[model samples]
Target chain A: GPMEALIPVINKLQDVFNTVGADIIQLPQIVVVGTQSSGKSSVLESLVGRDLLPRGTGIVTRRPLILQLVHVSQEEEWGKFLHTKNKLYTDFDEIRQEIENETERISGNNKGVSPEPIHLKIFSPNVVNLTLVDLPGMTKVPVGDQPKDIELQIRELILRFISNPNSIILAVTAANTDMATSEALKISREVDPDGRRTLAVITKLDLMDAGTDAMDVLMGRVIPVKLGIIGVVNRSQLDINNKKSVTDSIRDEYAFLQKKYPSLANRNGTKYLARTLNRLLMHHIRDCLPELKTRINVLAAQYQSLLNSRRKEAADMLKALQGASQIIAEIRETHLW
Target chain B: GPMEALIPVINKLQDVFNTVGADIIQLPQIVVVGTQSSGKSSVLESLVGRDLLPRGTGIVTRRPLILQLVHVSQEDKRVEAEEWGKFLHTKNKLYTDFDEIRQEIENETERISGNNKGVSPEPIHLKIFSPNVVNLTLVDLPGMTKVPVGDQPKDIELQIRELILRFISNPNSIILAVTAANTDMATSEALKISREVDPDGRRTLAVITKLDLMDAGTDAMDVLMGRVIPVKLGIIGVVNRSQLDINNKKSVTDSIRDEYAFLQKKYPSLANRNGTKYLARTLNRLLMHHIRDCLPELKTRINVLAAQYQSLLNRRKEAADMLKALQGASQIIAEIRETHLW
Candidate 1:
């Protein structure tokens, strides 16, 4: 019941972001950020409940991936890549290829990062509506084919998305490391100091030293933040190297949390993180609605003047502007009761 | 019946060390090491089942307390805890009252080191012949820390650590690296120092202290599991009465019982493998196996000395003092050495 209004609101906002491409206002979305190799892609796939990302190796993500998932009763697994115009891919294997190809096409074959974002609108029966941007993993070293200033480039690209006040930052860090050294937290604090909208996810809890748990860090026994940190254990490199299933991994993770961390069992793991992020993003959109409506009105006026000269560009803009207005009206429609 | 042989064997070897001192033979001992204010004395007090050690804010133990606990028979059980203490300054006097022992331990060190953040290698040995404990010798050293406190020298860290290294580096002592459960084990100064002495962990056992002080939802499961930092002698977790529990006047008996039960509920798998009771038993067990291995060396020495006694008697004949005395001495040494295969 809590998430009922949220999914539809997120679905409506993505339609607005896609319709007007460049100079378009950033919508309320989760900006997934973590240190390099901190399991960012697996979390994204785990949310979608599918293995949609390319497996293995250095810098799999060369460009920012803005994924919008929608669940429809009648629609099965199918997706639309914004770069390919109106073409739809029913096969998941093809979607993976498109993500890699699109990333390589814009950012070049080199390991350097690109600020250009690839939009993916997936209509699947397995997922709830949530738009998340998977940014480049924060790295200290530049490997082969990567530029010397790659760390600076990636940081700048990450800031561009997280800097948007409406965007919710899901900062991920390895459980083994001290949270004080989290690069994601370091950058997020510069933007959201009081951590008003920042949610922390601690990964690799299983890989930590013996008798040690992230209880103090998660419970704010170490450092208190407005939004609390959630402890989770992702699949190890070996389990993934063997190509383990998400369902089996999820089931095992459930057993692990329930057994090892009984006190925090329900509050931890990837599945809980997915749901918590959805609930937070919805509340975030509700907060942004007032200023968002004003921006939609101003953009609608700008599109109206452009229609006087161009018909094709204005036609798509007009429907998207109406979509934003309809979404605004839907919230009002709920409030009237 | 054969396993019971280990208890006496450990007892006999330690008795040799206590009587002859390490100058003649250094018997295997468990040297307890931990950081300052990091709960080293509490670990010892919990294990000894007493409030003998003076515990307070900074540097409560100015001198090492050599705690010698000897189990007494039911007939010898005292109405109160019995104690015997030997202070080096007096050199000949033996104190019986526990509070008297606690007082002498402070004065003995102050007389030698002058009491203003100074240290003395002189240790106060207190022997407790009780019906309560196993035959054990534990040397509790001053807590290890980085910075000097109060009137301590700026180089106090190096001084105390160097002193502890002398006791444990003997290779005849078992290392009990007492690390706080809440802190990272790699940075624990106690564990680091022990590794330098016992690199293969052949004689080292880790005692994870302050199990209850760890923040909620966090536990020392991996350290207990032995896969985190593998010590061949293994790790045992123990909980001491908190400052509040002590202030409330909780007895050591209740604290020990509570610690074992709390450990059981906190980690059901490690129910029997934890606490001060298990600590004593484990030390007893490790000492047995260690003493068992050292038995071969003792067998050689006894037989070698047995041969020397025989030669002295055969020389009393002024020509190998009647091979009669030599044969009897050599035969008995050979008889005891027979237990290697026996």
Candidate 2:
């Protein structure tokens, strides 16, 4: 239960961000970033313990699905949106449809993307107590109905989330690809220069060339990441087509880890990553809470002022009265008599 | 044995060149040129059926090796070995083991290269006398490297290019521009050099190595089909053993069979035009055509030299008399006129 300590705090804080999305205020977020086909969705699905997200060629069909995950310790799983009129989705297919519909609503049925994110709260016993934002997988090509500057648009949007001091960058990259061309790592390093809160997840460890392994990368023997890198072998296209269960997937992941890395098997993969985020957020909240309290109370006072005074006439009259009283106090100090 | 049939004819001509080191005429040779470690030696090893070349990182060693495969029969055996080595520098020392040849090559390369990363135009020659091999001479140029490292001269790039330009520029040389399948043929130094020298691509045969290692949905079809490398000599794709395969000591025989099957399964139309075996056969055919074109010119050069020698002989005979120097123009003309049977 104590592991759920950061869940409510993060959820409550992240609600303000979903209430008014995009540039209103930046909340500390775990921004999932990678070029498309980097198994970013697989990592998300593994973290959520669900196979709801579409993991294939044409990702970034929507703006982004910024979600707050809560561990309810219940068998039932459901989702609700922030902007779509209190609609709740129980069936996984409805959830998928809802995401598509929401994307279509903001950005027309055309293949364009919107900056407007679809905020959802997912309730399941399987997830960690964390708030994460899913940025559109970066794409270089502009499809037929997409804007010509779609690449720049996605890059800018990704920077908006991960550039925040509090945001944790979950840079998902395929183990098979060279890191030099990895756009996620390129962008993340530009923002987080010291690499303070970056975790490089080398996903799709199995698709690498024969007899080659990512142990060098994972061990930081190659590219040294301050936060370190971890490799996860996601289910292949065949396994996904077969509709494999998470149990078998997790079992295979463990077996692969043991075979590939005996020492790291204990502290690597989705389980370790999920637990790490939970612990980081809890520790982060402990540090962030004081300044967060101070910053928000100051904003809360302004919010209170606006809440107490929305009518222009009422606000003007109050300002006029304060001016007159201050005038009276200035004259009294003179003591002319 | 059918392959060995081509051997005797090749060696008979090659024997003249080998016996007379005095003939400075460039041999019609296959010069394996590519970016270092782009599978130059691998292709050579595949063709030779012997992994004897000193392999290293990126083929950065400046030691250029010119290999000639001489097929000998049972009676012409040297030291009772199937294969033997005779480095031109060695004073008739025969190397039977492949590793010893590599050692000798390294030792010989050290002399000109200053051995601490040396690049010299002077090549280390190794004549591999084998019964099974065809009489094909391949000049293995120093794999063109971008930079010099570890006591290598800073002008190493220029020197290597200069060295390459020298060989490819030789009108008799056939630039076997070997490039990895994964590389863009246009960017290959081998192709570039061949293009510069043989602008019409007249003398370049592009060899595509590592055809099996290309990424998914990508094949060497268009590349080998001549659009990637527009050399007139045509391009052929071949698969070579991976480092692991070599570490396990996998023979080139299996590699060729696998490549044939791969090409047949992958692209049947051009299956016969590609693979190590097909490349050797293709090269054999090309070299035959090439040899026909070269021999006449070679004979012409020999005739020209013969004429020059006859002039020298006549000059020497005249010098023996020593009377032409004293003779006046009138006397010389009268004497020449009288010698015309007056």
Candidate 3:
């Protein structure tokens, strides 16, 4: 019930600002970030309990997907897009197809990147009330027909989202890599120096070396983060190819986390990650409410000034016309010989 | 043979102008015009021997379709497919499915001009290479309308008129003005517009369509005989399929035969001078003659362009050489000057 009241208030403000065509106020949202192979799609797919993202090799997500999940339990679930408002996509498979088609329509099929975002809302009982921005993976090399300045372009895009002060950075890194050298964490620190609003996620927990484990990273001993550190085991590309369901992958993930580090299993994995994100986002939205209210009041005053000036100009013109009429009447009276 | 020498020369000039992205010279083309329901689509389909145009209730042709027909010998056809259409948008792929060609036209029309019957001046370039047609280029414009019907803009009439004038006003274009036999000839919209630009009817050829739909006791004999309005390129009549016939899936080939039979029965003596087949040949000949007259002027224009470009290149080289000398002078000054001394 607490979430039911808090999240909708943010959603309503989002609509009001969007309708007013003023993006002066930035709302609090969770921004997902990772490298090219950082399991960003799998993490998002697991959160929504549906496989709806366009997946392939080489920069699969060309446009930023602003995923808004609304928890509903009316015996029916659907997805809606702002651009295409007439139809309700009840089928998640068709949702994936639509995402691909829309991406190609704007960014084109040449693998070029675009800064324009795709806004999609999924209403389902399986999802929690949360808003997340799934950005293009942090890529360095320009492969295929990608632009030559792809590294700069992606960095610019990620910085635009994370630098919003109101955003919570969900920095994702693989377990096998050195935690101190994680690109996501490094970029997170650029905006989040104190790591207060940054939550680190360690993926590929099952792929650590035979005798090695990510216990130190999970416990925040390596590259300590203030918000917290979460460990999750996502499906491999091979597992994805064999048509493994998200539910089955979560089951396997639970078993692996329990066996590997039972002490941290309760605080890690995808289920724990989703619940933690939901709680974090709700509190962030609450904290940002006062600032958002002030921005809205300032914008409203600017518009009122504009409208009032137009009215005053019209009143002055009317007075000028009345004065002209009086002069014409006096001239006619003198000429009435 | 005379046409064989003339058509390709003009076609090559068109390609050159298109590649250079210049419209300084207007090449000879046949500009098709008529009122709505005047059988413009049927007449064009009959000319190409393919049903590839989108047909519907209102404003089906919202954008100008620059249809270019290239004649290819059956033995020289490279693709295993019989005949294919190519769009300027999708330049690499060949569209062989005639039905898909229609769909592409509709899709492209809606892409530029929305589906609310609004018109756009931007043209859709389509080239169909087949052995069935002569080497010809025709610009099919939106049909003339008097009233703004069904979600159409209040100034739809003005929009379409301006677009038509943009095409027909080109002196190099041969006007293929179409009018329905059922309508009053003196009040024909296409003729009135054509005569505005071409008062003497020098390049205007009147096409009398819907011969079968005229009132039972009336006929378009006087109009076909040029007794109503004299055209320098002459007047011809063509009969298109009725709505019933079209809805029944009647092929253009069958419709052509029916047109010939109808012409023979109504005016046996004018049968040779009437029908779509005759109209196509006449259009082909007129365009060829027009191109021949315009070729010398086109060549002079191209030569002038080349001379201008050469002058521009020479000036660019002179600037580069001046820059090189300036750099040497700057180097000499740098040898004597030092920032610390200053």
Candidate 4:
């Protein structure tokens, strides 16, 4: 219930700051970073219990998707975009299309990327209160029609988000890759050197070669983070191509983990991943409550001062108007004489 | 009739040169040069007798459209009254609908540049076969701009200028410098850029468009009379439909008639020298004569290339024969050595 109570404060704080256009006020949020095809979208979609992301071969996520999941007890569920204001997207397929259209609207038809973010809020009974920022996947070299400095541009955007001390870095990596040499971990380490505010999620658990497992990495034996690591099984490309449901994928994930690593099965699944993120985020928001309240007070004071100056200027304008009226009366009397 | 007879030879010559990858052979092409909203698209559509070019607010023509017009009469055909267009990318399909041609251009432009108003140097190759058109080829480039607008790159002005220079600097290109009649003729960016490429202005023709949009007291008489920035190929003035007329769905025919009436009333003495029909006819004649002049030069070049290639082939034949013989002897020597060892 702490998540139900405290998470809304952070959301309200974002609204309060955004009201005054004071983006410098940093609030707690999770920033997801990973290399291309690292199952970043899969992880986010699983958390929301919906297959609602646009998937493709290269750089499909051209704009940052700031997703906020809200758990509601209503019988109906829908989603809203900050940009589209009044429209409620009841069909998740339409939401997926909208995300693609909005991305191409600004980023262009080419495989270009923009630093702008799409704010989406989903209210469903199957989700928890969690805000996640899914970024454009990191790429090394430009592909067809991509800008030559795409790597640098993506790194710059990632750094801009993770460098905020209020953000919790959700570093995702593929289990088939080396954990020590992960691009996600390398970049997270640059910002959170102590790994104090970082949570590592190793995806593609079923993709590793035979006779090999990520038990050590999942257990934090190789490189450790303070918030801990959780390995999750995501639907493979073949499974997605076959149009398998997310519900079935979740079922298969649990089975895969139970069979592969029985001892670690309980703590390493999508359900566990979502629960862990919820718990971590709630505790992080609690820890950041004092500083967040102080930031709100500071912003309030600055806006109050701006308002007082404008009021004083308005009062002076009224005084000038009064004087002008008096002089106009005298001039009219003189003209009559 | 000369264009009908001799122009096909130039087209065939281009095919021959292309087959051998001889790009150094400069073929005659009309390179359209103008500033943004200088009526380049209008002039082009009038020439083709169809409104097919994509028109918009800023940098609408983002890539070069290398258009080839082939006149096809009934005698040359299999059921020949239908006019169609073909693009190099979609060679298997014939576009009978002109609206689809406009849509295709927009689609192809955004395919590489995206919707961000970015420009690409890659060109679209289109050929239209119509009985109404003369055999002609022209390259419509992105208009010159001094500043980049919404979502455009910072160096867009430089990029477009560079692209324009690349097309106009070709010796085989006749520069059609288009400027708005309301603007100062002496400082027209189109003619200024054209002068940079063709200093003598021998291959440059100036077109003063938007003649109806000029101020009431002023006209382009001085510019048309060769008093300001004279070009050797002569200056012609024409009028394009205003946004109001176009928004009302005016046809190009009515617009051409309106153009003639406006020119006749305003510049009575120069009325015969100006109009869309006159401009199209003048361009076709200029192209025919230009090709005729360049044909002899190209023939000489081809003969020299033939001589050079003959010498190269003879030398390579002797060397190839010797290499084969040496390889055969080496194989035999290896076989003899293996036999002795065994």
Best candidate (score: lDDT): 4
* Model 4 C-alpha RMSD to native: 27.4
Model 1: DockQ vs. true structure: 0.03
**What would the TM-score be for candidate 4 when compared with the true structure?**
0.42
**For each candidate, how many residue pairs have backbone atoms clashing (under 3 Å)?**
12, 0, 0, 0
lDDT per residue for candidate 2 within B1-342, as digits (tens), equals 224435544544544343222332333777888766677876766667677876533244466678887767667975225778898888698888888887777777777777455567787888988778776677777776543454556566677878888888888777788776654443355776677788777777888877776544456676777653355767888887766666677766676678788889987999887777767776666666655555555445444544554566666765433323222222322332232110
Candidate with best TM-score: 2
Q: For candidate 4, lDDT tens digit of each residue in B239-273?
A: 87765676677887788889889988888999988
Model 1 chain A worst lDDT window (10 residues): A1-10
Residue pairs of candidate 2 with colliding backbone atoms:
none
How accurate locally is residue B172 in candidate 1, as Cα lDDT from 0 to 100? 79
What is the lDDT of every predicted structure here?
A: 0.68, 0.65, 0.70, 0.71
Per-model TM-score, in order, reads: 0.46, 0.54, 0.41, 0.42
Expressed as tens digits, the lDDT of each residue in B99-194 for candidate 3 is 899999899999988876667889999998865445667788888764344456656667888889998999877887887665445435687788
**Regions of model 4 farther than 4 Å from truth:** A1-337, B1-27, B71-81, B295-342
- Measured by TM-score, how close is model 3 to the native structure? 0.41
DockQ of each: 0.03, 0.06, 0.00, 0.01
Which pairs of residues clash in candidate 3, taking residues 3 or more apart in a chain or in different chains?
A: none
Q: What does the lDDT come to for candidate 4?
A: 0.71
| TM-score comparison, 2 vs 4, better candidate | 2
Model 3 residue runs over 4 Å out of place are A1-337, B1-27, B71-76, B131-135, B294-342
Model 1 C-alpha lDDT per residue in residues B1-342, reported as the tens digit of each score: 011333444344544333222323334766888776567888766666667777654456777778776666556655254545555456777666766776776777677667665666678777766654666677889877543444667566677889899989987788888876755453356766887788778888888877775543456786688745566777888888766676677887788789878987898988787888777777666655654555555545545554665666654554353334334433443443344321
